[PDB]
Design a protein around this ligand. Sequence first.
Ligand SMILES: OC[C@H]1O[C@@H](O[C@H]2[C@@H](OC[C@H]3O[C@@H](O[C@H]4[C@H](O)[C@@H](O)[C@H](O[C@H]5[C@H](O)[C@@H](O)[C@H](O)O[C@@H]5CO)O[C@@H]4CO[C@H]4OC[C@@H](O)[C@H](O)[C@H]4O[C@@H]4O[C@H](CO)[C@H](O)[C@H](O)[C@H]4O)[C@H](O)[C@@H](O)[C@@H]3O[C@@H]3O[C@H](CO[C@H]4OC[C@@H](O)[C@H](O)[C@H]4O)[C@@H](O)[C@H](O)[C@H]3O)OC[C@@H](O)[C@@H]2O)[C@H](O)[C@@H](O)[C@H]1O
Ligand SMILES: OC[C@H]1O[C@@H](O)[C@H](O)[C@@H](O)[C@@H]1O[C@@H]1O[C@H](CO[C@H]2OC[C@@H](O)[C@H](O)[C@H]2O)[C@@H](O[C@@H]2O[C@H](CO[C@H]3OC[C@@H](O)[C@H](O)[C@H]3O)[C@@H](O[C@@H]3O[C@H](CO[C@H]4OC[C@@H](O)[C@H](O)[C@H]4O)[C@@H](O)[C@H](O)[C@H]3O)[C@H](O)[C@H]2O)[C@H](O)[C@H]1O
Ligand SMILES: [Cl-]
Ligand SMILES: [Cl-]
Ligand SMILES: [Cl-]
Length: 727
Amino acid sequence: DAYTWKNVRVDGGGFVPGIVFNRKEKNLAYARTDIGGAYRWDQSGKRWVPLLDSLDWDHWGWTGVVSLASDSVDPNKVYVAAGTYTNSWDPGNGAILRSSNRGASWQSTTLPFKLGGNMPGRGMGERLAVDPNRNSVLYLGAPSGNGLWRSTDSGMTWSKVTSFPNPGTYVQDASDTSGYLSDNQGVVWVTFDERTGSSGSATKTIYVGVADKDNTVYRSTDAGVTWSRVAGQPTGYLSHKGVLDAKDGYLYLTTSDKGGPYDGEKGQVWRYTTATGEWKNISPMADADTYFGYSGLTVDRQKPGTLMVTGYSSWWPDTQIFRSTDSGATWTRAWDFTSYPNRSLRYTQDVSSVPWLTFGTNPTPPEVTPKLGWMTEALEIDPFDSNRMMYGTGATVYGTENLGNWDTGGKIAITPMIRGLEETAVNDLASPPTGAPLLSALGDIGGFRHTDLDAVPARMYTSPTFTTTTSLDYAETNPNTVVRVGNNDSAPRIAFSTDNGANWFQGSEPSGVTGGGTVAAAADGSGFVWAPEGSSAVYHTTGFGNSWSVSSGIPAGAVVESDRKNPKKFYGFKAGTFYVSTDGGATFTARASSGLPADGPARFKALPGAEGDIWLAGGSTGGAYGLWHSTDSGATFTKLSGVQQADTIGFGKAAPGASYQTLYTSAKIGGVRGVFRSTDAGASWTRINDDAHQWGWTGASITGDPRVYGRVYVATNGRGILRGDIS
Ligand SMILES: OC[C@H]1O[C@@H](O[C@H]2[C@@H](OC[C@H]3O[C@@H](O[C@H]4[C@H](O)[C@@H](O)[C@H](O[C@H]5[C@H](O)[C@@H](O)[C@H](O)O[C@@H]5CO)O[C@@H]4CO[C@H]4OC[C@@H](O)[C@H](O)[C@H]4O[C@@H]4O[C@H](CO)[C@H](O)[C@H](O)[C@H]4O)[C@H](O)[C@@H](O)[C@@H]3O[C@@H]3O[C@H](CO[C@H]4OC[C@@H](O)[C@H](O)[C@H]4O)[C@@H](O)[C@H](O)[C@H]3O)OC[C@@H](O)[C@@H]2O)[C@H](O)[C@@H](O)[C@H]1O
Ligand SMILES: OC[C@H]1O[C@@H](O)[C@H](O)[C@@H](O)[C@@H]1O[C@@H]1O[C@H](CO[C@H]2OC[C@@H](O)[C@H](O)[C@H]2O)[C@@H](O[C@@H]2O[C@H](CO[C@H]3OC[C@@H](O)[C@H](O)[C@H]3O)[C@@H](O[C@@H]3O[C@H](CO[C@H]4OC[C@@H](O)[C@H](O)[C@H]4O)[C@@H](O)[C@H](O)[C@H]3O)[C@H](O)[C@H]2O)[C@H](O)[C@H]1O
Ligand SMILES: [Cl-]
Ligand SMILES: [Cl-]
Ligand SMILES: [Cl-]
């Protein structure tokens, strides 16, 4: 069987830090994400096309894209700087990935240091740049003290620019012992002045942005041999972007007192006249009235004099977008306070195509839902259409096709431009045997009852809303009964449904909960077992969580699951020990542990229709790793000898003429990392994905479909919910 892969339709759901239009070819554009690769625009379908799905389990870190560059001399060429963390969370050095067919296939060169696609500062840029006159020359701004790097053979080999004098100084929080907030944000954008080269000869003037409040912009005038700070530059702020209007000879800088993308409490906008050296402060608001940093910097290539910026970190009442048609001499805004706190709008916004973007809230005026945006580091005017612009938020990409209405005193029309760009971190998936085909547990946007896998759901889970759902379950014998738990600053962190997840209601909470953990539903829907994060025990309830008691004999934070057939049977796993209860979760006892994985994560599930039939996947290179099977309710497990490592396990409808339900697993088998299917209860396996469809780390969740043979739902970490079917 050949397989066809598509997303379950959600559209967006995470941060898009950068958008890039090609300057040579109309309608050529890309987007970069921090954990989910990169995308090419499809103008015909008004949708985004993922380009980095080939990156495998062992190269998951390359799915973080800190910068992207699209060659103006040869628009077939595109380059990405790949790598996710510079601390111990990402074991792999970063890389430059190069393609000569607009992202259809890639080659890599590994750098001798790590890159920061999901680090602080990731909305500054673009820090990877191609010479617009001799396009075999590239530059890369590097983090952590590594400075400025260069290639002169179209990105195949890289070496340090030793003559660059300042590797950056800025650190968000030096005290963070995890290394996440404590890295030097380094060299953050690179911009050529294309007027200073000619075809085949290196561009002589190069501007470089540095995360150093005392020296945020450097220049070379001799094609990168020597460097100097730009004289008279403003100090006290970090330049998130540097953009050059070459027709008028203006270099623009949007600066902030923080690195972003979340923080930023002051900032400025400056204009540097390249011919004379003059600096002008063109900030849209007075400093006393500024409570955010600036970024979102873009010039209209077809109408020099026109530019826009954002107050990227304005959290209330909304983000702010600013526009000038006179090179920063005067500005107008997407909205204005009239009689404080009431507001005037210069735009309308229609999210009927992605209805869940209201987040189910009812905010107090002057706030509205959906918001104009937030975290708007990326804002771009189409170089070939003055009436189109796109910008990124923490949840979506918004755009307009009548931007000129702004200049004639009308209102611009904003809509999501996000279809195909699937960014969610998926924690858990369920495909019950009746009702909707899928229920999702997602970071940041909660999750959905998917009534139609090919349509965006109307609304995330509400009443209560969860920031993130960590685990969900349903009653095997009545899938109208559903439970979920998740993360929230305050109670409630558990919710139930009696109508298959269409409408919810909260429960009460046991002691000390700080987050979702895992949850399990009795097979008949009569009660539940909750292993929350933070709390000092596991708890069980009869009915909908009105009264909780401690589950004795199982440790806090175990993974909990329910038997599918015996309502009184529940299971737990933690740290190499399997736990069983036969009284609804009131008491557990330690059963098997012999040979079960003691180190690393695990996933396990009981089989629909079979009491005591349990499959468990997990472990790590620190100890045992693989797939185990018990048919005696966890008294003994057998390790499957031909599965070298495994991380997830799930089930779907039996094959025609098969004794047993079909198994699906994210695993390593016969030396190959991939997604595998068995129709003979794990005696043999067939790989059902392929080297173009890998999606990095898929260790969170997998399930088949009880009603559709062959179908598999694969959780990803930043590419949404992937759906495979037999072709
Ligand atoms: O994915 C979580 C999952 O990871 C499992 O490990 C996998 C995995 O690990 C990589 C790394 O992931 C971190 O979490 C990421 C998350 O994966 C992303 O989805 C998420 O993205 C955002 C994105 O940033 C937004 O821009 C976008 O809009 O939405 C998405 C989705 O929300 O980011 C988080 C990290 O968040 C921080 O960075 C991004 C910032 O935006 C964000 O503000 C910031 O959050 C702060 O986070 C810190 C975190 O400590 C804190 O909560 C602050 O309060 C908060 O504000 C994990 O954080 C990180 O640990 C993962 O690294 C690996 O950790 C493994 C386990 O380590 C522990 O156990 C072993 C022990 O030795 C260690 O000491 C101990 O820490 C470790 O084994 C592994 O080696 C590390 O790589 O992907 C690769 C795979 O190999 C890993 O197995 C993990 O097992 C599981 O439990 C779960 O956490
Ligand atoms: O009503 C209060 C309101 O007015 C003023 O009083 C106050 O000054 C304002 O701050 C406040 O606005 C609210 O501000 C907070 C930000 O808060 C702090 O930063 C500024 C400081 O002055 C202040 O002291 C701090 O407390 C916003 O919270 C953030 O919310 C967004 C998501 O909310 C948005 O999405 C839902 C929609 O309904 C909202 O309209 C919209 O604003 C979060 O963004 C998401 O974050 C995750 C990653 O998160 C994790 O990492 C960051 C960490 O802060 C967080 O705790 C972790 O969970 C990304 O994956 C998503 O891509 C991204 O969308 C911010 O994390 C969160 O800080 C309030 O939204 C705002 O109302
Ligand atoms: Cl269509
Ligand atoms: Cl119109
Ligand atoms: Cl985990």
